[PDB]
Amino acid sequence: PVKLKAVVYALSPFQQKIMTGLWKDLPEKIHHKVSENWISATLLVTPVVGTYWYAQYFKEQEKLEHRF
Amino acid sequence: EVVEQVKKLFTKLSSDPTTTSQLVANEPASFTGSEVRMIDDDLPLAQF
To answer: Is B30 touching A (CB cutoff 8 A)?
Structure first.
């Protein structure tokens, strides 16, 4: 057991609003999600999308070359 | 003897008629479900 020194105040679940917090400070939530994860989203989407488009470009050139 | 002494000595009291019932109705007390936990592992006994 860890020795702990702390004071905790808690409110009853039936004395507070339950769902309205979902759509509170929404602009801040979106800004935090975008600004912290845009590098992570870039590192996942770019290799997948870039490789996919290169394959389609390769297939289109190969298909046209074999035509008469 | 107490009554005669009281009406002679208590003559400077305030005469404001504001009842305590009125004060209670103006600032009512209500119960809120909640809790406060003061965690101190150095105390030998728990008191709640």
So the answer is: no
